[PDB]
Amino acid sequence: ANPLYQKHIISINDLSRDDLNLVLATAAKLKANPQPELLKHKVIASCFFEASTRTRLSFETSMHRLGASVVGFSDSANTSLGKKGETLADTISVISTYVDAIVMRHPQEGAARLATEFSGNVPVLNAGDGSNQHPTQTLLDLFTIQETQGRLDNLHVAMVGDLKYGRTVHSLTQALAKFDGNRFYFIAPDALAMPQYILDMLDEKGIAWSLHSSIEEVMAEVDILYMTRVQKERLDPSEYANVKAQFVLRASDLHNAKANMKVLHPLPRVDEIATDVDKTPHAWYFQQAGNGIFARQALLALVLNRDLVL
Amino acid sequence: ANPLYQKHIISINDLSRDDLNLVLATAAKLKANPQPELLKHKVIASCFFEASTRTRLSFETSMHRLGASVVGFSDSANTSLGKKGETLADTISVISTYVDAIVMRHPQEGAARLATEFSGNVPVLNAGDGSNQHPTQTLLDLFTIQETQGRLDNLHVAMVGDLKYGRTVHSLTQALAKFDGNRFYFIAPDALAMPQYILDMLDEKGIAWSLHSSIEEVMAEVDILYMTRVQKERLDPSEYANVKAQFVLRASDLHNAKANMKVLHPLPRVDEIATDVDKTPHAWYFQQAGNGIFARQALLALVLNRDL
Amino acid sequence: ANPLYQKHIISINDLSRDDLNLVLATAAKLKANPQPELLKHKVIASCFFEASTRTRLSFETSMHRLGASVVGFSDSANTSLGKKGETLADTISVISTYVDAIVMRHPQEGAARLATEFSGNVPVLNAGDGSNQHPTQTLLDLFTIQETQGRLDNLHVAMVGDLKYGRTVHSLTQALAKFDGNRFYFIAPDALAMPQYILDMLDEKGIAWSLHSSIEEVMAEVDILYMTRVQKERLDPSEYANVKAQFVLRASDLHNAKANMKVLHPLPRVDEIATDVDKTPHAWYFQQAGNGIFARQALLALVLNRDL
Ligand SMILES: O=C(O)C[C@H](NC(=O)CP(=O)(O)O)C(=O)O
Ligand SMILES: O=C(O)C[C@H](NC(=O)CP(=O)(O)O)C(=O)O
Ligand SMILES: O=C(O)C[C@H](NC(=O)CP(=O)(O)O)C(=O)O
Ligand SMILES: [Ca+2]
Ligand SMILES: [Ca+2]
């Protein structure tokens, strides 16, 4: 049976290693051979309460590539919530009477989990809830790491930049921690460090990690260098001094990288990755974004179709 | 047969009891047996000039469930009317060369009727025109009453809140008055009473109505309690003291309700229906909203297809 | 595959007379006999960074009429470029991993050509780049001239209004100069005259053109009277005195028109065409806009389908 059928997809913490492997296997099959009528007769809501380029466009393209239709909004200003004072709860309660699943991105932490209390039998998929979780970004990142490295175990992974507000690294560290032998290098300003709740989970599973003040000091050891943007729009006033990127990666900084190493970045970037890195063999952030199509199609098919494909 | 084929749907005042009943019968069949390719090859415009959550999203979902495609906008800011100075008449004249029907909501009363002067042979469906009419809200409201009450005649119905600017109750009161023996109770602030042209219509048809100062006093006799939001964005500045809801429905008010009674609301609500009512068996505003899918699929099918 | 398969469509200056005839013949075949599954399985991006009613809505409709799906935005405010500081180049690099083609309108001249540097194998179709080019407006304008005049050669064509900033007339003059024996009349304020680079091209081909101070001077000879809007959003405030239309067309000015003459306007219009013109048989601006459906379906079919 399909373990993800009709399930809410809110946090990586709720998913098992086996569930992650199932999405990846389903993504490889659909990347090889499309299923243009799999979700014919399904209508999906796409509801974005804060800005997006890749996550909204890739999700909607995936819906069309499976034959489903889409309704929704990319801003809340002209909804009833935006002009007539409606609650978020009431908005989910009526939208659940129209569609087969709801994709939602929202600026407040916990908003996706709150929507599950009001959606009845319709599954809710978290496209990002403030600085907390981003589970579909992690699905595509795992697919990408697997594709370039050949495995998801025994890897050296560095995460750089704003780790405190990075919903992308919270989800990706929790998922890489379900596999065996992975090790982490965290390179961030003291003010934007990886939160203690993530570190405590690593400690409880016996996973190695360390803190660094430069990229160059561990460059020779990493398989995946995962760069991030400072989350300007989430910063508290006590962190305004941290708005500019602290680490800036240049092509010349790649002298000592392993030949197999790849540079990833959930995007968008500001100046933390210079454009001269774009032409090197290590740049893989645009390929990573292209993999969002296969991961999000796999998640949609698993949540809305009873039977596994194959 | 099909008397609604290619008709503009602007006002309840223009439809007959038989026209209402055909839309309801068609909605019931489509709910029981869907027809996913009924409007394949159609392209419909969805043109919203003011805010919406239920009406726009339900209409677009209904079009996709019948196999049609949709184009349009949810705000006029980025159109040529919004930035290059184009008139509404010219906007309608060009969109009419592209699509098979136009769904339009607009802040000004009369704007949907105005669109029919420029759309040519393309049907215009009014999704709300200022505080005047809201005919597809009435079609889903009638479908809900009929499903919960088992009939549309000889009912006791109360309408509470902003009846002056409520496009929803103007349309619903006109449609219920086409059926026999209904009785109405209106519970509103003095500044936002039901308009005189609606009361004159009821008096001409011999339909009884009365004015009340609370929800409690009519609770034992009503079959349908229809709650409404204060239309804050339509109020005149001289009426700004009426922004907070005057009447609030709470679960304990339902203590002497009739077993069959249902609480409706076109939505969205502010505080006029407390959230403790949602769990009671009388709450039916979310089911009512879900019924917009069947009523709006039925209207689209009848206007766009020659045969029933 | 055909000669336009997988090509970027940025400028008329890059297309041949044979490329233009191909689109026109495909447009006629699709108008006479639709192919609603032709682009089944194609997903196209529609990325508008400045306002539009006609170009975006007719392009999306054309996509649906051939079975394709569409994703995108009608403004950039809620994209990552709009709120997180993303560059336009990174925006095209990622959208090109999702779709089969990209339709783009942008306020900066040369922006569509820049996008072809980052889109890899994905075709970019320019829906307007500042005051520079507008190649799909020219394709529907050619289609319209052919349908009403029976040909695209031996015509007298007058272009009135803002010729300096009108992207429409830069593209159309370049295209009509690829056919035979046409003669042009340019009627514009001196501050907004046809640019020199266009006039030099005509001279190099031996094409006859002249400048006129009134519409009455050439009314008796024209086959096509192409009216234009002053491009307010492109002017410098020092040129603000030219905002009001210098030339207003009225139904009374058509008394000595040829019986075949048609008045065209890419739209929207502000004050340059009075509404009394609309009911004359010479008015053809709404019919021209309807022809964007056939011209845009044809171009999408040739760019995305290998066979004919
Ligand atoms: O915004 C970031 O820096 C990373 C991440 N980015 C994305 O999801 C891509 P987008 O915002 O374009 O959908 C996010 O958390 O929103
Ligand atoms: O706004 C109201 O209170 C009643 C009614 N509401 C609706 O139609 C629901 P919505 O605005 O979400 O489409 C309306 O007249 O617009
Ligand atoms: O704007 C004009 O006056 C002419 C021309 N107009 C159009 O293309 C029509 P629209 O802006 O509605 O797509 C343009 O250059 O954008
Ligand atoms: Ca009316
Ligand atoms: Ca010839």
PDB file of all heavy atoms in Angstrom, chain A residues 173-200:
ATOM      1  N   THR A 173      18.777  19.153   7.180  1.00  0.00           N
ATOM      2  CA  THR A 173      19.566  18.481   8.247  1.00  0.00           C
ATOM      3  C   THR A 173      18.738  17.384   8.893  1.00  0.00           C
ATOM      4  O   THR A 173      19.260  16.285   9.167  1.00  0.00           O
ATOM      5  CB  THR A 173      20.026  19.487   9.308  1.00  0.00           C
ATOM      6  OG1 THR A 173      20.714  20.572   8.690  1.00  0.00           O
ATOM      7  CG2 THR A 173      21.038  18.851  10.293  1.00  0.00           C
ATOM      8  N   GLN A 174      17.462  17.589   9.217  1.00  0.00           N
ATOM      9  CA  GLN A 174      16.624  16.535   9.766  1.00  0.00           C
ATOM     10  C   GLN A 174      16.530  15.345   8.810  1.00  0.00           C
ATOM     11  O   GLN A 174      16.601  14.194   9.251  1.00  0.00           O
ATOM     12  CB  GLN A 174      15.176  16.995  10.103  1.00  0.00           C
ATOM     13  CG  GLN A 174      15.120  17.982  11.294  1.00  0.00           C
ATOM     14  CD  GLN A 174      13.727  18.521  11.534  1.00  0.00           C
ATOM     15  OE1 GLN A 174      12.852  18.521  10.631  1.00  0.00           O
ATOM     16  NE2 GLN A 174      13.440  18.993  12.761  1.00  0.00           N
ATOM     17  N   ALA A 175      16.482  15.585   7.482  1.00  0.00           N
ATOM     18  CA  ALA A 175      16.369  14.408   6.584  1.00  0.00           C
ATOM     19  C   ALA A 175      17.672  13.671   6.375  1.00  0.00           C
ATOM     20  O   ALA A 175      17.730  12.426   6.397  1.00  0.00           O
ATOM     21  CB  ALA A 175      15.833  14.856   5.206  1.00  0.00           C
ATOM     22  N   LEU A 176      18.798  14.363   6.300  1.00  0.00           N
ATOM     23  CA  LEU A 176      20.093  13.728   6.113  1.00  0.00           C
ATOM     24  C   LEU A 176      20.442  12.970   7.399  1.00  0.00           C
ATOM     25  O   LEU A 176      21.064  11.900   7.313  1.00  0.00           O
ATOM     26  CB  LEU A 176      21.182  14.735   5.721  1.00  0.00           C
ATOM     27  CG  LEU A 176      21.106  15.214   4.249  1.00  0.00           C
ATOM     28  CD1 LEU A 176      22.027  16.417   4.028  1.00  0.00           C
ATOM     29  CD2 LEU A 176      21.473  14.028   3.355  1.00  0.00           C
ATOM     30  N   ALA A 177      19.913  13.433   8.545  1.00  0.00           N
ATOM     31  CA  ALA A 177      20.128  12.742   9.796  1.00  0.00           C
ATOM     32  C   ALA A 177      19.379  11.420   9.885  1.00  0.00           C
ATOM     33  O   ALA A 177      19.770  10.604  10.737  1.00  0.00           O
ATOM     34  CB  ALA A 177      19.851  13.653  11.001  1.00  0.00           C
ATOM     35  N   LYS A 178      18.439  11.080   9.004  1.00  0.00           N
ATOM     36  CA  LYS A 178      17.787   9.786   9.010  1.00  0.00           C
ATOM     37  C   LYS A 178      18.598   8.705   8.287  1.00  0.00           C
ATOM     38  O   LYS A 178      18.230   7.509   8.260  1.00  0.00           O
ATOM     39  CB  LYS A 178      16.366   9.906   8.402  1.00  0.00           C
ATOM     40  CG  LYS A 178      15.508  10.828   9.270  1.00  0.00           C
ATOM     41  CD  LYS A 178      14.129  11.043   8.709  1.00  0.00           C
ATOM     42  CE  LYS A 178      13.264  11.904   9.686  1.00  0.00           C
ATOM     43  NZ  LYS A 178      12.424  12.716   8.783  1.00  0.00           N
ATOM     44  N   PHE A 179      19.615   9.061   7.542  1.00  0.00           N
ATOM     45  CA  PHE A 179      20.499   8.155   6.821  1.00  0.00           C
ATOM     46  C   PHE A 179      21.739   7.896   7.667  1.00  0.00           C
ATOM     47  O   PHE A 179      21.870   8.487   8.744  1.00  0.00           O
ATOM     48  CB  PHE A 179      20.859   8.721   5.442  1.00  0.00           C
ATOM     49  CG  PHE A 179      19.649   8.788   4.543  1.00  0.00           C
ATOM     50  CD1 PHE A 179      18.836   9.931   4.616  1.00  0.00           C
ATOM     51  CD2 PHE A 179      19.337   7.773   3.656  1.00  0.00           C
ATOM     52  CE1 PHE A 179      17.705  10.024   3.816  1.00  0.00           C
ATOM     53  CE2 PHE A 179      18.216   7.908   2.828  1.00  0.00           C
ATOM     54  CZ  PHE A 179      17.386   8.988   2.954  1.00  0.00           C
ATOM     55  N   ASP A 180      22.615   6.963   7.286  1.00  0.00           N
ATOM     56  CA  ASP A 180      23.751   6.658   8.179  1.00  0.00           C
ATOM     57  C   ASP A 180      25.062   7.306   7.842  1.00  0.00           C
ATOM     58  O   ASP A 180      25.414   7.499   6.679  1.00  0.00           O
ATOM     59  CB  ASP A 180      24.029   5.136   8.175  1.00  0.00           C
ATOM     60  CG  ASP A 180      22.898   4.329   8.760  1.00  0.00           C
ATOM     61  OD1 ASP A 180      22.491   4.551   9.920  1.00  0.00           O
ATOM     62  OD2 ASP A 180      22.417   3.439   8.018  1.00  0.00           O
ATOM     63  N   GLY A 181      25.833   7.657   8.888  1.00  0.00           N
ATOM     64  CA  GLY A 181      27.167   8.194   8.670  1.00  0.00           C
ATOM     65  C   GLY A 181      27.397   9.547   8.085  1.00  0.00           C
ATOM     66  O   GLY A 181      28.533   9.835   7.630  1.00  0.00           O
ATOM     67  N   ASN A 182      26.400  10.425   7.984  1.00  0.00           N
ATOM     68  CA  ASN A 182      26.580  11.748   7.437  1.00  0.00           C
ATOM     69  C   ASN A 182      27.238  12.655   8.472  1.00  0.00           C
ATOM     70  O   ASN A 182      27.028  12.461   9.674  1.00  0.00           O
ATOM     71  CB  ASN A 182      25.237  12.336   6.965  1.00  0.00           C
ATOM     72  CG  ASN A 182      24.738  11.632   5.707  1.00  0.00           C
ATOM     73  OD1 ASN A 182      25.512  11.254   4.825  1.00  0.00           O
ATOM     74  ND2 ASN A 182      23.419  11.448   5.600  1.00  0.00           N
ATOM     75  N   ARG A 183      27.933  13.680   8.005  1.00  0.00           N
ATOM     76  CA  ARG A 183      28.615  14.579   8.934  1.00  0.00           C
ATOM     77  C   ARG A 183      28.440  16.019   8.448  1.00  0.00           C
ATOM     78  O   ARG A 183      28.471  16.252   7.240  1.00  0.00           O
ATOM     79  CB  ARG A 183      30.090  14.153   8.936  1.00  0.00           C
ATOM     80  CG  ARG A 183      30.987  15.089   9.745  1.00  0.00           C
ATOM     81  CD  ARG A 183      32.369  14.431   9.969  1.00  0.00           C
ATOM     82  NE  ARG A 183      33.300  15.495  10.416  1.00  0.00           N
ATOM     83  CZ  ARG A 183      34.544  15.285  10.819  1.00  0.00           C
ATOM     84  NH1 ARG A 183      35.028  14.034  10.862  1.00  0.00           N
ATOM     85  NH2 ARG A 183      35.295  16.321  11.182  1.00  0.00           N
ATOM     86  N   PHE A 184      28.229  16.937   9.384  1.00  0.00           N
ATOM     87  CA  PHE A 184      27.961  18.335   9.032  1.00  0.00           C
ATOM     88  C   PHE A 184      28.979  19.369   9.463  1.00  0.00           C
ATOM     89  O   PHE A 184      29.572  19.382  10.552  1.00  0.00           O
ATOM     90  CB  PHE A 184      26.590  18.731   9.619  1.00  0.00           C
ATOM     91  CG  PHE A 184      25.439  17.859   9.167  1.00  0.00           C
ATOM     92  CD1 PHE A 184      25.165  16.672   9.824  1.00  0.00           C
ATOM     93  CD2 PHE A 184      24.610  18.234   8.111  1.00  0.00           C
ATOM     94  CE1 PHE A 184      24.114  15.853   9.438  1.00  0.00           C
ATOM     95  CE2 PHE A 184      23.557  17.421   7.719  1.00  0.00           C
ATOM     96  CZ  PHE A 184      23.286  16.224   8.379  1.00  0.00           C
ATOM     97  N   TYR A 185      29.178  20.379   8.610  1.00  0.00           N
ATOM     98  CA  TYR A 185      30.026  21.537   8.872  1.00  0.00           C
ATOM     99  C   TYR A 185      29.155  22.792   8.802  1.00  0.00           C
ATOM    100  O   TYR A 185      28.613  23.133   7.701  1.00  0.00           O
ATOM    101  CB  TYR A 185      31.195  21.572   7.893  1.00  0.00           C
ATOM    102  CG  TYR A 185      31.994  20.288   7.776  1.00  0.00           C
ATOM    103  CD1 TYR A 185      31.571  19.243   6.968  1.00  0.00           C
ATOM    104  CD2 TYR A 185      33.176  20.098   8.488  1.00  0.00           C
ATOM    105  CE1 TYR A 185      32.307  18.071   6.852  1.00  0.00           C
ATOM    106  CE2 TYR A 185      33.914  18.958   8.378  1.00  0.00           C
ATOM    107  CZ  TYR A 185      33.474  17.939   7.559  1.00  0.00           C
ATOM    108  OH  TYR A 185      34.210  16.774   7.460  1.00  0.00           O
ATOM    109  N   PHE A 186      28.949  23.488   9.929  1.00  0.00           N
ATOM    110  CA  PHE A 186      28.089  24.661   9.957  1.00  0.00           C
ATOM    111  C   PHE A 186      28.865  25.975   9.999  1.00  0.00           C
ATOM    112  O   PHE A 186      29.700  26.171  10.889  1.00  0.00           O
ATOM    113  CB  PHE A 186      27.123  24.638  11.150  1.00  0.00           C
ATOM    114  CG  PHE A 186      26.234  23.429  11.251  1.00  0.00           C
ATOM    115  CD1 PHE A 186      26.105  22.691  12.414  1.00  0.00           C
ATOM    116  CD2 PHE A 186      25.500  23.028  10.117  1.00  0.00           C
ATOM    117  CE1 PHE A 186      25.299  21.573  12.466  1.00  0.00           C
ATOM    118  CE2 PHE A 186      24.655  21.929  10.164  1.00  0.00           C
ATOM    119  CZ  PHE A 186      24.539  21.177  11.361  1.00  0.00           C
ATOM    120  N   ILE A 187      28.724  26.802   8.975  1.00  0.00           N
ATOM    121  CA  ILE A 187      29.443  28.053   8.803  1.00  0.00           C
ATOM    122  C   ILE A 187      28.463  29.223   8.718  1.00  0.00           C
ATOM    123  O   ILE A 187      27.873  29.550   7.681  1.00  0.00           O
ATOM    124  CB  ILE A 187      30.328  27.999   7.540  1.00  0.00           C
ATOM    125  CG1 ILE A 187      31.327  26.824   7.630  1.00  0.00           C
ATOM    126  CG2 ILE A 187      31.076  29.299   7.327  1.00  0.00           C
ATOM    127  CD1 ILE A 187      31.667  26.156   6.321  1.00  0.00           C
ATOM    128  N   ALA A 188      28.290  29.882   9.860  1.00  0.00           N
ATOM    129  CA  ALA A 188      27.361  30.980  10.031  1.00  0.00           C
ATOM    130  C   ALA A 188      27.836  32.000  11.049  1.00  0.00           C
ATOM    131  O   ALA A 188      28.630  31.747  11.933  1.00  0.00           O
ATOM    132  CB  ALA A 188      26.053  30.384  10.604  1.00  0.00           C
ATOM    133  N   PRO A 189      27.266  33.199  10.970  1.00  0.00           N
ATOM    134  CA  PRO A 189      27.517  34.237  11.950  1.00  0.00           C
ATOM    135  C   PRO A 189      27.006  33.712  13.289  1.00  0.00           C
ATOM    136  O   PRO A 189      25.970  33.033  13.293  1.00  0.00           O
ATOM    137  CB  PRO A 189      26.726  35.464  11.484  1.00  0.00           C
ATOM    138  CG  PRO A 189      26.024  35.102  10.231  1.00  0.00           C
ATOM    139  CD  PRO A 189      26.255  33.615   9.985  1.00  0.00           C
ATOM    140  N   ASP A 190      27.587  34.144  14.400  1.00  0.00           N
ATOM    141  CA  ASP A 190      27.106  33.677  15.709  1.00  0.00           C
ATOM    142  C   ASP A 190      25.618  33.955  15.845  1.00  0.00           C
ATOM    143  O   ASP A 190      24.799  33.176  16.308  1.00  0.00           O
ATOM    144  CB  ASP A 190      27.852  34.296  16.900  1.00  0.00           C
ATOM    145  CG  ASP A 190      29.346  34.154  16.913  1.00  0.00           C
ATOM    146  OD1 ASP A 190      29.891  33.210  16.280  1.00  0.00           O
ATOM    147  OD2 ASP A 190      30.050  34.971  17.566  1.00  0.00           O
ATOM    148  N   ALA A 191      25.206  35.186  15.449  1.00  0.00           N
ATOM    149  CA  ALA A 191      23.840  35.666  15.484  1.00  0.00           C
ATOM    150  C   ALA A 191      22.870  34.820  14.656  1.00  0.00           C
ATOM    151  O   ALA A 191      21.704  34.685  15.095  1.00  0.00           O
ATOM    152  CB  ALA A 191      23.686  37.149  15.078  1.00  0.00           C
ATOM    153  N   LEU A 192      23.319  34.227  13.558  1.00  0.00           N
ATOM    154  CA  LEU A 192      22.392  33.396  12.756  1.00  0.00           C
ATOM    155  C   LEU A 192      22.775  31.915  12.758  1.00  0.00           C
ATOM    156  O   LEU A 192      22.659  31.228  11.730  1.00  0.00           O
ATOM    157  CB  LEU A 192      22.427  33.949  11.304  1.00  0.00           C
ATOM    158  CG  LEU A 192      22.109  35.457  11.173  1.00  0.00           C
ATOM    159  CD1 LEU A 192      22.109  35.898   9.714  1.00  0.00           C
ATOM    160  CD2 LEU A 192      20.742  35.740  11.815  1.00  0.00           C
ATOM    161  N   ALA A 193      23.178  31.376  13.899  1.00  0.00           N
ATOM    162  CA  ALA A 193      23.660  29.997  13.992  1.00  0.00           C
ATOM    163  C   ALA A 193      22.573  28.959  13.904  1.00  0.00           C
ATOM    164  O   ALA A 193      21.408  29.244  14.157  1.00  0.00           O
ATOM    165  CB  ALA A 193      24.480  29.810  15.272  1.00  0.00           C
ATOM    166  N   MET A 194      22.947  27.706  13.580  1.00  0.00           N
ATOM    167  CA  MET A 194      21.943  26.638  13.511  1.00  0.00           C
ATOM    168  C   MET A 194      21.344  26.550  14.904  1.00  0.00           C
ATOM    169  O   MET A 194      22.092  26.603  15.894  1.00  0.00           O
ATOM    170  CB  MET A 194      22.665  25.329  13.087  1.00  0.00           C
ATOM    171  CG  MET A 194      21.720  24.130  12.926  1.00  0.00           C
ATOM    172  SD  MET A 194      20.586  24.314  11.514  1.00  0.00           S
ATOM    173  CE  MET A 194      21.718  23.770  10.213  1.00  0.00           C
ATOM    174  N   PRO A 195      20.020  26.458  15.018  1.00  0.00           N
ATOM    175  CA  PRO A 195      19.353  26.407  16.304  1.00  0.00           C
ATOM    176  C   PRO A 195      19.698  25.175  17.136  1.00  0.00           C
ATOM    177  O   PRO A 195      19.874  24.029  16.637  1.00  0.00           O
ATOM    178  CB  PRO A 195      17.856  26.392  15.971  1.00  0.00           C
ATOM    179  CG  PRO A 195      17.781  26.913  14.564  1.00  0.00           C
ATOM    180  CD  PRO A 195      19.060  26.477  13.895  1.00  0.00           C
ATOM    181  N   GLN A 196      19.607  25.357  18.457  1.00  0.00           N
ATOM    182  CA  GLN A 196      19.919  24.272  19.397  1.00  0.00           C
ATOM    183  C   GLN A 196      19.050  23.042  19.236  1.00  0.00           C
ATOM    184  O   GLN A 196      19.512  21.942  19.503  1.00  0.00           O
ATOM    185  CB  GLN A 196      19.815  24.758  20.859  1.00  0.00           C
ATOM    186  CG  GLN A 196      20.483  23.806  21.864  1.00  0.00           C
ATOM    187  CD  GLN A 196      21.970  23.644  21.644  1.00  0.00           C
ATOM    188  OE1 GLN A 196      22.679  24.650  21.528  1.00  0.00           O
ATOM    189  NE2 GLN A 196      22.471  22.492  21.591  1.00  0.00           N
ATOM    190  N   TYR A 197      17.777  23.168  18.839  1.00  0.00           N
ATOM    191  CA  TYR A 197      16.932  21.991  18.691  1.00  0.00           C
ATOM    192  C   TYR A 197      17.417  21.045  17.610  1.00  0.00           C
ATOM    193  O   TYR A 197      17.147  19.842  17.726  1.00  0.00           O
ATOM    194  CB  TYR A 197      15.478  22.341  18.457  1.00  0.00           C
ATOM    195  CG  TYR A 197      15.024  22.786  17.081  1.00  0.00           C
ATOM    196  CD1 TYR A 197      14.508  21.876  16.164  1.00  0.00           C
ATOM    197  CD2 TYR A 197      15.093  24.126  16.717  1.00  0.00           C
ATOM    198  CE1 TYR A 197      14.061  22.281  14.903  1.00  0.00           C
ATOM    199  CE2 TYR A 197      14.650  24.538  15.465  1.00  0.00           C
ATOM    200  CZ  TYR A 197      14.127  23.622  14.589  1.00  0.00           C
ATOM    201  OH  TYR A 197      13.711  24.054  13.353  1.00  0.00           O
ATOM    202  N   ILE A 198      18.068  21.544  16.581  1.00  0.00           N
ATOM    203  CA  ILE A 198      18.661  20.739  15.513  1.00  0.00           C
ATOM    204  C   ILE A 198      19.909  20.096  16.117  1.00  0.00           C
ATOM    205  O   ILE A 198      20.090  18.889  15.921  1.00  0.00           O
ATOM    206  CB  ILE A 198      19.078  21.616  14.305  1.00  0.00           C
ATOM    207  CG1 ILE A 198      17.846  22.226  13.619  1.00  0.00           C
ATOM    208  CG2 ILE A 198      19.942  20.918  13.269  1.00  0.00           C
ATOM    209  CD1 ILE A 198      16.934  21.261  12.892  1.00  0.00           C
ATOM    210  N   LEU A 199      20.749  20.890  16.808  1.00  0.00           N
ATOM    211  CA  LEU A 199      21.995  20.305  17.317  1.00  0.00           C
ATOM    212  C   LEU A 199      21.677  19.171  18.300  1.00  0.00           C
ATOM    213  O   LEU A 199      22.424  18.191  18.294  1.00  0.00           O
ATOM    214  CB  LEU A 199      22.903  21.344  18.003  1.00  0.00           C
ATOM    215  CG  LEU A 199      23.235  22.576  17.140  1.00  0.00           C
ATOM    216  CD1 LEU A 199      24.123  23.535  17.925  1.00  0.00           C
ATOM    217  CD2 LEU A 199      23.972  22.193  15.860  1.00  0.00           C
ATOM    218  N   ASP A 200      20.702  19.381  19.176  1.00  0.00           N
ATOM    219  CA  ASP A 200      20.343  18.330  20.156  1.00  0.00           C
ATOM    220  C   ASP A 200      19.950  17.039  19.456  1.00  0.00           C
ATOM    221  O   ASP A 200      20.231  15.950  19.974  1.00  0.00           O
ATOM    222  CB  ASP A 200      19.175  18.774  21.042  1.00  0.00           C
ATOM    223  CG  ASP A 200      19.590  19.823  22.071  1.00  0.00           C
ATOM    224  OD1 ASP A 200      20.805  20.024  22.271  1.00  0.00           O
ATOM    225  OD2 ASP A 200      18.725  20.524  22.650  1.00  0.00           O
TER     226      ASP A 200
END
